[PDB]
Structures are given as C-alpha cells and as structure tokens.
Design a binder for these strands. Structure first.
Lengths: 62, 38, 99, 66, 195, 123, 100, 44, 100
RNA sequence: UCUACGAAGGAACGCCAAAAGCGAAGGCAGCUCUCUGGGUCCCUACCGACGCUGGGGUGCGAAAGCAUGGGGAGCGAACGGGAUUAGAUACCCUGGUAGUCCAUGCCGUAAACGAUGAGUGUUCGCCCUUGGUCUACGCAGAUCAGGGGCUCAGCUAACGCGUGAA
C-alpha cells in the first residue's frame, strides 16, 4: 500500500504501532528491504524501532 | 509409477488394518484400471 | 536531554493510583531543577504478548507519557522505578521529531 | 501460521497455509540453521558460497531474460 | 556543404555512445552522439579515392557483408562491377565463415552438397572492403596478419584491437535510418573510371 | 468452542503423538516406537510418522471426537507434515464415514530465538 | 612501423616485392585528425529548460522555443503567452485536421 | 562579509530564545496536577 | 513563563561552551578560530576535561587522548620557532612547560 | 518420554542482515540511557607550510594458557564405560571436571592472510552501491567520501590485478 515512501521516517517510531505493524510479517518476522520498497537507512531505523518496541513488549514475538 | 505405488500402499492399508486379508479390498481394480496406463 | 518517559502500567485497577505514583516524579523533577511539558496518557492498549507472567497482567495494559527534560543522572534515579507495582515497562527514551 | 479449515476443504487450506508461511520467510528459517554447530570460520565460508551460488544463478537468469 | 546537408538528412552523424574514440564527436544528445560529418565525408574522400586508384591497376577487391539488410544495395555491385563475378557474389552471399584468407588454399573438398553451398574461391584480394557489426572478425584479423589494407565501417563500438589495425576507417555510424544507400558512391567509382 | 488438541512431535529418530484436552491433559499417547517392530533401525523413517498418525487416527476415531485441533511441532520440510496429516486423516476416517475431518489446523515450531551452543559436528 | 610506413620501409630495404595497392595507398592517405583529449562535450540546444516542461503540457515547440527566445531578451514569463500561441496553432491545425 | 554568517547563526540561535520553549503554554509543577486534568485523554 | 532560567546548568550534556570561552580569551581577531595557540588552548582544556571521566578501560578513547597530546606537542614544537614572545605567553597562560 | 502452567537460573543474542556498516590492527552487533574517540559533507571563515616515513623505544594486541575471587545452563580437553578393530589411546554413543562466562591483573603470540608495509601525484570506461552535498520538474543530472564487481590499456615466468601487481 501507501506506506512505502520517506513518510515512513516521520511515521516510524516505536510509540506508533500501525505504520510498523504493517511491516512485521505473517509469522512475526521483519521483512526485507526487498519485500517492500524502502531505503537502507530506513530499514535500519525500522529495525531499531521494532526491536525497541518488541523489547518494551509493545509488539509481538511469534 | 505414482498412482500405481500410492494406490498400492493404500490398498495395502488392508494388511495394515484387517488382520492380514479380508478381501473387502476386492474393490481394488481401480488401481489396475490406472496401472494398465501406457 | 529532553526525555519522553513512557509508562506501561498494569490494568486499570487503582485509578487514583498511578497518577500519584507519577506525581512522585512530578515532585522529583520540580526538585532537581527539571522541567516537565505534557503528561498525555493513552488509555488501554493491548500488549503484543504475555509479558511479566509474574502476577500476570499482560493483556490490555495502561500507558502514560511524562515528557520531561532534566539532569542526565535521571535515569540512575529512575532506577528507583522498576520494582514499582503497577508500572511494568518504564521507558525513558528521547525527544524525537515524531509525535 | 493459523487457519480455520473452511468447511472441510483441508487442501485449499494447506495451499494458502503453505504459500503464506513459506512466503513469510519463516520456512526459509525452519529449513535453515538447525544443524549440529558452526563456528565463525565455517560461517563466513558458507556465506561466501551462498553469495557465489546466487551470483551464478543470476548470471543464468539475466541470460534467460530474452 | 550541401552534401553535408544531405549526410545530416541521412540519419547518420548520430549514434549511441559505445566509444573508444573521441576525435570525432561533435557532442552528445543523451541517446545519440554526433560525429563530425565533415570528417565522415573526408574519410569517404580518401578511401573512395584509394579504391578508384587501385582500379588503375585493377586489383581484386572482394567486399564482405553478413548483415543482410544491405544485401540488395550491395548486390547491385560486385557483379558486372568491381570484381564483376556474380557467381563469386554468391560466395559473398554465403561466405566469410570457414578457413579464411590465410589458409585459403585449403582442400575444402568434401561437399556432400545437400542444401549447402560450399564455394571456396581462392585469390589474394589486394584490398578489402567490409560493412557489418562484428561476426566477420576473421576477415579483419587475417587482413591485418597478411598486410592487406581494409576499408571498414566503424561505429562507436569498435575494440582497439580492430580500431587500430584497420586502416581507412569510414566512421559512417549506421543508426535510426538503419541501412540506406551508401555504396552507390563506390558504384559511381570504378565505373566510368577505368579508361 | 471447546475442543481437544492432538500433538505430533517429529524428531531425529523418534516422534510421538499425544491426544489431550485443550488445557494439556495427556489422554492417549503413542511413541513411534510404541508399535510392533517399529523401533531400532526402524526408528529413522517417515513411514514411522505415517503409521503413528494413522494408528492414532483409528484410535481417536474409536473414541469419536471429530472436533480436535491438530498441531505439529517439529523441524522439517513441509512435505513430511503434509504426509503425516494425510496419514492421520486416513486412520481417522477410513474406518468411519467418508468425511471425518478436523475442526482446525495450526502450526507451532518454536525457534530458538538465539543460540545455546548446539553440539559439535560428526566425523 | 605503422601499417602504411612499415610496408614502405620494407619494400625500400627490399624485404619483399611490392604489393599491388601501394601506389594508391600512398596516393590516398588515411583520414587523420588532430589528437584531442577525452571530454565529449555535452552539446545542447539553447532552448532546453522549457521544452521538457512543455511537451509535458502538449515537436513543434521543441523548435518554437527559438521563435520565443527571439523576444526572450525581454521575456519576463512569456511562457504563458507562448503556450497560448501553441493553443492557437493547435486549435486551428486541429480544426483543419478534423475538416479534412 | 562573513559577518553576515555571524549574524545568521546568532539569529537562528536566538529565535526569540526559541519561542517554542519561551511559549506561554507551559506546565507548572507546583500545580493542580494537569495529570488529574487528564481524564479526557486518560482514555486516549 | 518563569521557567526560562530553569532551563540551565542541569539540562546540559555537551558543556562545550568552555571551548568557545577560552578560544575567545586567546583569539586575536573575530571569527579567528583557527590559529596555532588557539588550537593549543582548545586541546589543553580538552585534555583536562578528558583525563577525568575515562575508566582506564576505554582504551580506544585513551588512544584518542594520546594522539591529542602528541599532536599538541607538535603544535608547540612549531610554535616555539615562529613567535617566541607569543610562545612564552602560551606557556605562562596555559601551564605547559618547555623542553627544547 | 510426552503434555499444560510455574519457578530457578545460566548463556547467546532469532529476524533485520547486508561481497551492508564502524576501527589503526585483534576486532565490533537483543534493546535504552550517560560519558567518549576518529570520520565525511558543507558556502566555506581563519591559520599558515606546521607535512610523509620512521632505526633503538611506546601502547594496543582474538583463542588457548596463568593468578585471585565469583558463576557454571549448554558445550565440552583430561578421563569412564558402550562401542567399533587384526589392534584402537581414535573417529561413533552415553557420562563427564578443568576450560568457555564476570571481576581484575600476567602473558604478547594466530594461515594476526586483500598470504599484497606506509604515503603522494598522474591513469579508458561501464556496472553497482553506503552516506553527504548541489541542480531538479517526471527524473534524474551533477558532485565527494568510501565498499564491491567488469573491463581499454600497462604489467606478469605462469596465474592474474587493474582502491595496481600501472
């Protein structure tokens, strides 16, 4: 869908949940920089954010 | 090949299930109808 | 050091509770020459997964925000928090561009 | 992955089940690292050989794009 | 001048950048490069003169082509013109391939002429004239080996190992017009020349 | 609603089936060695799981449950589990009416979210 | 030696006998050019910065930006009147090309 | 000339002592607990 | 609004206003932040800031310090044979000592 | 055994993920925070030749090893048995301490391996790509730092490199 551009930067923070729950896949895995269209800096920020939230117990683990 | 062997072992579920041989699996001529495939 | 302190609390129980519990920090940061801005809550939120199987209380937890700025060591005071009852996941992070 | 068997379909069920799970990458994990053990040396070496497998197969494909 | 107008109409000076030379490019246009059409014409001057002089001793020529878009344009020549052999023109139709131009006196005896041609003619061509892209490479190599001069169309695409051991380069650059009448200039030449 | 679970635990040279309530109460078990002449060199096969699931199908048919979430928890190619579920349905059904399926299906192979020094390689 | 002068020196020092293309080879030298460096200059029509943005709108302007630059010495934003003139020519040309 | 950049940096640092922080919309800590105020957003 | 000044001395991490301050003390003209003695003073206060809060295990950062002090030795080694007056000034005001 | 919930602990950090990235080298990753080194881009301001290398010397330097005090899940030298063989100190199985881990100290070595000292200038391109910058008008074009292939040439006993092995 439409969460593919650089807007994700403004809209990618472990407090927010929908922009990000869009990324964790079916079985609870982060999806590649290929599975979507997104940049490298981006994917790294998303990785920090999903791991922070998940450690905060804010997002799933399986 | 494949239908032969699969329907074969499934027929053999007879010797699996009934003690050794109750030929209620006399029914197994369909596997032959597909084995005669050339 | 403009920190936003999220607080993931145990269930709704003790309404006039967590408010005074964070009032503790309110006095903390009044003292120590700190500064608060805005204390917005978010109400119920369903947790991802069954945290803290001790005492349980891992579905539908409470969340608040404190949004202070203060002395650095404030994290090594906040280590006063962790064993608090209702709070589960005190998290003081940073001020970021995102609201 | 979870699925209710739609009114005893049980084969289209498995179809979407697999397809979704496999695509989820998780399959590429449970078939992935489970073996006896690997150290850093063997790890880097197998990574290098995976890279070479992929570069060879991509050469074949880029050839087969006409 | 007016001829330069005509070349410029001939969709020729412009061709994509696949280059080893830059002595030629008037510029570029992001999808084309513009060569110096005056240099084009000057190359034609020199080489066409050379062929019209070699005429004055009547030395065999033996054109070469493999991309059969010019086939008709060229076939109007090399039979009753230049080499003058239509039967050899048929070799040229189906040639360049085998043991070539240096082991020209090969046996090649085995025909079994079932839906094959198998010409194999043999005489030293004192000059060569080609036009195609790259499959013909054997002719260039062997000419450079045995000291045979060559006229050749070169696009930006030419490896140094050809661009430097082929004399007389006609940097014509066939492009969007594809194959258009050129050889009619050398058709003018060698006929109403040999007096 | 309320329903049992039947669990199947593929392993290296052994696998088991445990038929239990929703809240984990072992009612009917079967080891891939709990069959006549299917242990020893016999332990390492996929027909092991085949026979196990079909036998447990006949058993959990004799007791007519028919509303039992079936789960597989092991580390394999999906082909092995496909064949084992087909076998379980076989044993369940082909001594009963034509259709005697499961109410559900669901998968659970918990991944070790990190390492614990899995033992060294064989030689 | 080069393919043209090697051979001359060869035959002159009497190595091999003369080829049948020599008198003409010298009479028609190869077309040499001044040895120049790299840097194939990007050559541009002076009317670039608007055709890109105008064919966006709607060839003939690809050259009519010249008939606009001619007054472009005191052109504030005459892009609007230019596209207007283009409207005019397209209107009349398509009236004609629908009357045909 | 670069006095201009002097000015530019001093200004960008002034920004009315950062009006965002100089704002009247602040939060007194000795106060009636804007926490207690939060009953609407308490369920936000 | 009285919360302006309760934004000081405690909401602070960098505290590299001291660099600006001392660089000022030692700066000749305005926006002149790149002369030799100036860099010397900045290195000096940096060394005195960093020789306190490192745990005798942050060895990389210690190496940073070592490179700092020896580049400072280089700075002074050149400083001494250009403007000797300013160099005595340097040692006097900065507490460093001479060893030809 | 298994099967559900718990508790204890230890140990490493699944996916991301990467011929990606950071470091002088050895090396470095679950997360958050304080402190902290070096870097590149950037109109560019200053400053002014202060640079490069570097004998004897100085620090850093994985793993194993040592010392003292912790900890010890799993792994697992030594060793025990099951084995296996003509024989078996072994490979195969099951046990299993030292060791792995933390605290501080000691060593100071590795295929410490691009098997390629350090630095400066000049060199045909294409493909990429990490992060900067300028320019944007359907979209990129440009410019820097790097990391990675492929090549013109050049070199090489041969392979090959071409961020050089020019």
């Amino acid at each position: 869908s439409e969460v593919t551009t650089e807007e994700v930067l403004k809209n990618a923070d472990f407090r927010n949940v929908r922009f990000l729950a869009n990324f964790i896949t079916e079985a609870g895995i982060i999806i590649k920089r290929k599975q979507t269209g997104i940049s490298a800096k981006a994917q790294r920020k998303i990785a920090r954010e999903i791991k922070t939230a998940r450690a905060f117990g804010l997002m799933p683990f399986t | 090949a494949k239908p032969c062997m699969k329907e074969m072992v499934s027929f053999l579920n007879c010797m699996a299930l009934n003690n050794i041989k109750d030929d209620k699996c006399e029914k197994q001529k369909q596997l032959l109808s597909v084995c005669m495939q050339g | 050091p403009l920190y936003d302190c999220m607080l993931l609390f145990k269930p709704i129980i003790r309404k006039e509770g967590l408010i005074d519990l964070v009032a503790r920090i309110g006095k903390h940061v009044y003292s120590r020459n700190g500064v608060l801005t805005e204390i917005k809550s978010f109400g119920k939120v369903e947790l991802g997964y069954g945290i803290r199987k001790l005492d349980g209380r891992h579905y539908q937890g409470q969340l608040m925000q404190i949004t202070m700025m203060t002395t650095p060591n404030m994290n090594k005071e906040l280590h006063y928090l962790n064993k608090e009852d209702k709070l589960l996941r005190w998290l003081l992070v940073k001020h970021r561009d995102i609201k | 992955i979870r699925v209710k068997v739609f009114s005893n379909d049980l084969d289209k069920a498995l179809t979407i089940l697999q397809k979704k799970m496999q695509s989820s990458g998780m399959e590429r994990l449970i078939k992935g690292t489970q073996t006896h053990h690997i150290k850093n040396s063997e790890k880097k070496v197998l990574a290098r050989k995976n890279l070479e497998r992929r570069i060879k197969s991509i050469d074949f494909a880029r050839k087969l794009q006409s | 001048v007016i001829q330069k107008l005509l070349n410029t109409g001939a969709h020729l000076g412009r061709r994509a950048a696949e280059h080893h030379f830059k002595q030629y490019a008037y510029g570029t246009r992001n999808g084309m490069t513009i060569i110096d059409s005056d240099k084009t014409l000057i190359c034609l001057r020199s080489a066409a003169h050379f062929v019209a002089n070699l005429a004055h001793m009547r030395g065999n020529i033996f054109f070469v082509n493999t991309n059969p878009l010019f086939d008709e344009i060229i076939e109007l020549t090399s039979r009753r013109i230049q080499g003058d052999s239509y039967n050899h023109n048929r070799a040229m139709n189906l040639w360049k391939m085998g043991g070539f131009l240096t082991n020209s006196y090969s046996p090649k005896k085995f025909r079994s002429r079932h839906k094959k041609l198998c010409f194999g003619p043999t005489t030293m061509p004192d000059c060569v004239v080609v036009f195609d892209s790259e499959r013909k490479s054997s002719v260039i190599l062997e000419a450079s080996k045995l000291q045979i001069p060559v006229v050749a169309i070169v696009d930006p695409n030419v490896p140094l190992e050809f661009f430097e051991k082929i004399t007389y380069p006609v940097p014509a650059r066939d492009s969007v017009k594809f194959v258009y009448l050129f050889c009619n200039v050398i058709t003018k030449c060698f006929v109403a020349e040999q007096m | 609603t309320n329903a049992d679970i039947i669990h199947i635990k593929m392993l290296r040279n052994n696998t088991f089936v445990t038929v239990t309530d929703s809240k984990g109460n072992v009612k009917c078990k079967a080891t891939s060695g709990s069959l006549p002449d299917l242990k020893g060199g016999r332990k390492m096969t996929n027909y092991t799981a085949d026979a196990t699931a079909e036998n447990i199908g006949r058993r959990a048919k004799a007791m007519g449950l028919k509303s039992v979430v079936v789960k597989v928890n092991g580390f394999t190619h999906f082909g092995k589990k496909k064949k084992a579920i087909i076998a379980f349905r076989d044993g369940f059904t082909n001594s009963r009416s034509d259709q005697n399926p499961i109410v559900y299906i669901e998968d659970t192979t918990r991944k070790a979210h990190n390492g614990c020094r899995l033992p060294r390689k064989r030689r | 030696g080069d393919l043209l002068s090697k051979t001359r020196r060869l035959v002159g020092g009497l190595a091999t006998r003369e080829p049948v293309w020599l008198k003409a080879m010298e009479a028609s030298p190869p077309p040499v050019f001044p040895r120049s460096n790299g840097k194939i200059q990007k050559i541009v029509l002076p009317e670039d910065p608007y055709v890109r943005k105008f064919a966006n709108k709607h060839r003939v302007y690809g050259c009519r930006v010249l008939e606009l630059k001619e007054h472009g010495i005191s052109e504030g934003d005459a892009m609007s009147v230019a596209n207007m003139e283009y409207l005019s020519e397209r209107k009349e040309m398509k009236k004609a090309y629908k009357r045909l | 000339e670069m006095w201009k950049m002097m000015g530019q940096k001093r200004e960008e640092k002034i920004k009315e002592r950062e009006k965002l922080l100089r704002e009247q919309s602040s939060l007194w800590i000795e106060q009636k607990e804007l926490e207690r105020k939060i009953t609407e957003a308490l369920v936000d | 609004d009285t919360y302006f000044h309760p934004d000081n001395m405690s909401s602070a991490e960098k505290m590299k206003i001291e660099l600006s301050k001392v660089r000022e003390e030692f700066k000749m003209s305005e926006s002149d932040c790149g002369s030799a003695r100036v860099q010397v003073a900045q290195l000096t206060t940096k060394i005195k800031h960093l020789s306190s809060s490192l745990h005798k295990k942050d060895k990389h950062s210690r190496k940073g310090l070592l490179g700092m002090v020896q580049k400072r030795k280089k700075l002074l080694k050149y400083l001494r044979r250009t403007d000797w007056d300013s160099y005595c000034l340097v040692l006097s005001k900065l507490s460093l000592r001479d060893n030809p």
